[PDB]
Amino acid sequence: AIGEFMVSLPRMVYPQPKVLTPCRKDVLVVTPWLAPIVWEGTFNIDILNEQFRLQNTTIGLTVFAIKKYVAFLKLFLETAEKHFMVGHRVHYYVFTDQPAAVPRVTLGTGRQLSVLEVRAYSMRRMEMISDFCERRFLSEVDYLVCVDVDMEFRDHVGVEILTPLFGTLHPGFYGSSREAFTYERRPQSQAYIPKDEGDFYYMGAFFGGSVQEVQRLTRACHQAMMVDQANGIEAVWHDESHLNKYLLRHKPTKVLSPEYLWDQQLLGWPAVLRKLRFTAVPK
Amino acid sequence: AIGEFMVSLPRMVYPQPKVLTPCRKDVLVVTPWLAPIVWEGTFNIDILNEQFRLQNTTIGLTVFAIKKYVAFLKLFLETAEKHFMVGHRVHYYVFTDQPAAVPRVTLGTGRQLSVLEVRAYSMRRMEMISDFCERRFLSEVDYLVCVDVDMEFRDHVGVEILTPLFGTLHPGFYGSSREAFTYERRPQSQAYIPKDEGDFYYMGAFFGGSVQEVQRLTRACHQAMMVDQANGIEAVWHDESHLNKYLLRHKPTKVLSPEYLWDQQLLGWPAVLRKLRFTAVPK
Ligand SMILES: O=c1ccn([C@@H]2O[C@H](COP(=O)(O)OP(=O)(O)O[C@H]3O[C@H](CO)[C@@H](O)[C@H](O)[C@H]3O)[C@@H](O)[C@H]2O)c(=O)[nH]1
Ligand SMILES: O=c1ccn([C@@H]2O[C@H](COP(=O)(O)OP(=O)(O)O[C@H]3O[C@H](CO)[C@@H](O)[C@H](O)[C@H]3O)[C@@H](O)[C@H]2O)c(=O)[nH]1
Numbered sequence: 001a002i003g004e005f006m007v008s009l010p011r012m013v014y015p016q017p018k019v020l021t022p023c024r025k026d027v028l029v030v031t032p033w034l035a036p037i038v039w040e041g042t043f044n045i046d047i048l049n050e051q052f053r054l055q056n057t058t059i060g061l062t063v064f065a066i067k068k069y070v071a072f073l074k075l076f077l078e079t080a081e082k083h084f085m086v087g088h089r090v091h092y093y094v095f096t097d098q099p100a101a102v103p104r105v106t107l108g109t110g111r112q113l114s115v116l117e118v119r120a121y122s123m124r125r126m127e128m129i130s131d132f133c134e135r136r137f138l139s140e141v142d143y144l145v146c147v148d149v150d151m152e153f154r155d156h157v158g159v160e161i162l163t164p165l166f167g168t169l170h171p172g173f174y175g176s177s178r179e180a181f182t183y184e185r186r187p188q189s190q191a192y193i194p195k196d197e198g199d200f201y202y203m204g205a206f207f208g209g210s211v212q213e214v215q216r217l218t219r220a221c222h223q224a225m226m227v228d229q230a231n232g233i234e235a236v237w238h239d240e241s242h243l244n245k246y247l248l249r250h251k252p253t254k255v256l257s258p259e260y261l262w263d264q265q266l267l268g269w270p271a272v273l274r275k276l277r278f279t280a281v282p283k
Numbered sequence: 284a285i286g287e288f289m290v291s292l293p294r295m296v297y298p299q300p301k302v303l304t305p306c307r308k309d310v311l312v313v314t315p316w317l318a319p320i321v322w323e324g325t326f327n328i329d330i331l332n333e334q335f336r337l338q339n340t341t342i343g344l345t346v347f348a349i350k351k352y353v354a355f356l357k358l359f360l361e362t363a364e365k366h367f368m369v370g371h372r373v374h375y376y377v378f379t380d381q382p383a384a385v386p387r388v389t390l391g392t393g394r395q396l397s398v399l400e401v402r403a404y405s406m407r408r409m410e411m412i413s414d415f416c417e418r419r420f421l422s423e424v425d426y427l428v429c430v431d432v433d434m435e436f437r438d439h440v441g442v443e444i445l446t447p448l449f450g451t452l453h454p455g456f457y458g459s460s461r462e463a464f465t466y467e468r469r470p471q472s473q474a475y476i477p478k479d480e481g482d483f484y485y486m487g488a489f490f491g492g493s494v495q496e497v498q499r500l501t502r503a504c505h506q507a508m509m510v511d512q513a514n515g516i517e518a519v520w521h522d523e524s525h526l527n528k529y530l531l532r533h534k535p536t537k538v539l540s541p542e543y544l545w546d547q548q549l550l551g552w553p554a555v556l557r558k559l560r561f562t563a564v565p566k
């Protein structure tokens with residue numbers, strides 16, 4: 001459930017948060033619209049796990065594995081079992097054109113996987129999430145997390161991310177000024193963002209929120225992409241360009257740091273990243 | 284409205300939030316359960332005003348002025364007009380045993396004041412907010428802000444505070460360790476908090492949230508106070524002790540810094556306070 005009567009937390013023993021000590025002084029930990037930016041050191045996972053377990057929270061995870069990308073599923077799912085929402089109810093939704101190529105992955109208790117067959121041809125994920133699966137998701141999960149498959153979990157990804165709407169800071173651009181962001185810059189596209197606008201550059205590979213907010217986002221992005229197609233224009237970074245436009249105009253209620261979407265081959269392991277949680281696999 | 288369909292923000296020009304620059308490095312700006320702590324420099328009020336105006340947000344402000352405390356109403360209300368939620372819809376609810384002693388204060392457009400008569404005898408405010416005014420508030424406002432009257436506004440107090448549930452850091456204790464907090468320490472009281480528990484010491488003089496969450500808090504505190512009365516025990520700091528117990532067990536979704544409740548006579552003007560927003564008046 002979301003937003004239902006919340007019972008009292010039990011007694012807990014943990015370090016006192018000290019008002020005149022920030023943990024993190026090296027990074028921005030709250031946006032100018034008062035959304036937390038989730039970095040290691042900003043959250044006590046024991047408190048958050050209590051809060052979300054007391055709501056019997058169910059998290060849906062969507063992933064698309066079409067054509068050759070079915071090869072990424074084994075590592076993706078096996079590492080999700082080690083690191084993604086462990087202790088909570090999880091429902092994986094694997095969208096594929098090859099149901100027989102989905103690996104048989106052993107799941108922990110309280111976790112389930114559904115294989116959903118789709119047609120083969122990145123930009124049509126918005127349609128599938130919003131048009132075909134709307135009723136399914138509303139009936140089955142509280143939150144949806146939507147990710148790329150060519151990835152692996154290396155460290156904790158848990159309920160600290162959950163909120164009505166979140167995006168993830170793109171690992172390539174978190175230190176960049178907005179003029180350098182690769183937003184869509186042609187006014188003829190629905191994804192257009194002028195050089196004097198923009199908070200962050202969010203990566204299309206990891207977003208989520210409540211089912212209602214994720215359906216709103218994916219519907220809006222799908223509609224905007226259809227308008228662009230009718231006008232003979234394709235945004236520079238496809239669904240990611242539209243996601244960025246949406247999150248500019250509809251501020252996320254949490255922002256995930258690049259701990260949550262990293263490429264170590266391309267970008268190494270900077271001091272500001274205390275953990276690499278969810279990382280690109282080659283190809 | 285709260286939680287209803289949110290239209291797109293318009294184009295806005297403002298400084299880019301920079302990920303590798305925190306504004307505030309001198310204070311904790313997010314709790315360990317990922318609630319913002321509201322300090323000057325952490326929010327862009329233009330973004331927040333847009334978000335809340337697009338919901339046509341109405342804020343109720345409750346204040347009690349019983350017996351000699353009617354004398355505080357003129358300054359309280361006149362300064363609220365200068366500083367409290369200016370531009371938003373406001374409904375003041377003034378609870379008094381002397382309706383004729385309520386000063387005639389001129390209000391800005393979109394703002395209204397209701398005088399509610401009560402009996403004369405600090406601890407029964409929880410009952411009035413939760414038992415007598417439940418239906419009224421649900422029909423009339425989106426958020427409730429509940430404050431002491433022996434106060435004045437000196438600077439902006441606006442929609443940055445609004446959230447499902449908030450408390451305010453007590454100005455006397457924000458730098459203190461939890462063992463020094465003046466929580467109720469007798470196990471025989473419903474307000475009891477052991478020396479190894481506690482996040483913050485919240486002041487009873489400024490709390491709020493959505494109408495639903497404020498009714499939950501005030502009902503719980505009223506019930507706990509009734510249990511203590513039946514057991515012949517009175518908590519050390521009365522309603523404030525119970526508020527603290529509630530907010531330990533039900534984490535607030537924002538915490539206000541002591542900018543929002545200050546006593547300059549007793550505590551001066553420390554460097555960590557960039558603004559003194561809402562301050563004690565003598566007596
Ligand atoms: O033949 C394909 C191609 C894509 N995918 C799916 O689509 C995702 C995105 O494609 P990918 O090749 O991973 O794109 P990237 O270049 O790694 O990522 C960029 O492109 C994506 C799609 O626009 C965005 O999600 C990312 O944010 C952006 O960095 C994949 O992970 C799969 O889940 C398939 O299943 N089969
Ligand atoms: O004769 C009275 C006494 C109290 N009040 C109301 O009750 C409030 C609280 O009383 P006050 O005298 O202001 O208490 P303080 O000692 O200033 O404040 C402490 O006591 C309050 C009541 O327990 C808590 O709200 C505060 O957090 C705590 O710091 C007042 O502001 C009024 O709104 C009256 O209207 N008439």
Ligand SMILES: [Mn+2]
Pocket residue numbers: 148149150205
């Ligand atoms: Mn990818």
Ligand SMILES: [Mn+2]
Pocket residue numbers: 431432433488
């Ligand atoms: Mn007072």
